[PDB]
Ligand binder design. Structure first.
Ligand SMILES: C[C@@H]1O[C@@H](O)[C@@H](O)[C@H](O)[C@@H]1O
Length: 295
């Protein structure tokens, strides 16, 4: 990734083209969850724009909580998606598993299709590159049937079964024994393991629970930046090169190469642990971690 800037410059010419070429070639990828309610185009008081995101990012997740102002969604559609696409950055909408097990939607083939159609509007209306499902709970038999049905309906438009080039992503804090994963693994582009605060020594065990269902390049492990007023996971302690985030950038499963890493709350890149104020960011941690993976 020598072609990436040592600061947060947005390249423009042959300098941009080299970044677009880097992204088309083999490399460990970097993804980031951008908390939508923290975007400067949402409400008041925020300091970071999705426009700020570093050129060498591979995937930005639009990660809302549902109280965002209309202006955020307008800006995403009209300004952010075009600008990130100009940088070869993919933009994926995140939705919680709760949305796919919502009992307002019939637990039938027609209901799975109807709910998939509604979810595909969050992709198609914004010009996005796919959908990310956040799975952080176990499912009862009925929930598992409904979620599996929706994934199978989505797989007509997204992910490896679709042929569209659009992504279907499974992000989870659970392992590859979860029934939902056993049901939907053939539909998935990337699997992202929420690994905030975890032991470097337990990473192989988790990877081993998925590895029969994927190739290693589909697998990403995630750390968290420090969220204002949030959990102190301690993934981004100083010095950087000793951090959990840095150890994740360097970690490889035995005999294979992982797909890469992601951050939770990429809008918080470089804010000190315990600092509960909002700050601008030049994405030093994101840019350095891309370098750590692609030397
Ligand atoms: C229950 C928690 O869920 C996610 O936040 C993971 O990132 C943590 O490591 C932990 O498993």
């Amino acid at each position: 990734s020598s072609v990436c800037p040592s600061d947060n410059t947005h390249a423009t010419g042959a300098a941009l083209q080299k970044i677009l070429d880097y992204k088309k070639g083999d490399h460990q990828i970097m993804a980031g969850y951008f908390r939508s309610w923290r975007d400067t185009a949402s409400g008041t008081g925020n300091k970071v724009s999705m426009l700020d995101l570093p050129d060498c990012l591979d995937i930005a997740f639009v990660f809302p909580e549902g109280d965002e102002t209309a202006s955020f969604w307008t800006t995403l559609k009209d300004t952010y998606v075009p600008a990130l696409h100009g940088r070869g950055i993919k933009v994926v909408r995140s939705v919680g598993i709760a949305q796919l097990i919502n009992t307002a939607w019939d637990n039938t083939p027609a209901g799975w299709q109807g709910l998939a159609d509604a979810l595909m509007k969050t992709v198609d209306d914004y010009g996005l590159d796919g959908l990310d499902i956040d799975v952080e709970q176990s499912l009862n038999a009925n929930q598992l049937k409904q979620a599996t049905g929706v994934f199978n309906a989505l797989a007509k438009k997204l992910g490896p079964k679709s042929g569209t080039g659009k992504l279907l992503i499974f992000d989870t804090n659970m392992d590859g024994t979860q029934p939902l994963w056993r049901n939907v693994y053939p539909t998935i582009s990337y699997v992202l393991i929420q690994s905030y605060g975890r032991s470097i020594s337990g990473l192989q065990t988790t990877y081993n629970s998925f590895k029969s269902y994927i190739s290693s390049k589909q697998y990403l492990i995630g750390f968290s930046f420090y969220e204002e007023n949030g959990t102190n996971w301690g993934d981004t302690t100083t010095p950087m090169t000793s951090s959990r985030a840095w150890q994740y950038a360097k970690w490889q499963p035995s005999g294979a190469t992982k797909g890469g890493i992601f951050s939770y709350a990429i809008d918080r890149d470089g804010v000190a642990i315990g600092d509960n104020t909002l700050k601008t960011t030049d994405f030093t941690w994101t840019r350095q971690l891309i370098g750590a993976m692609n030397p």
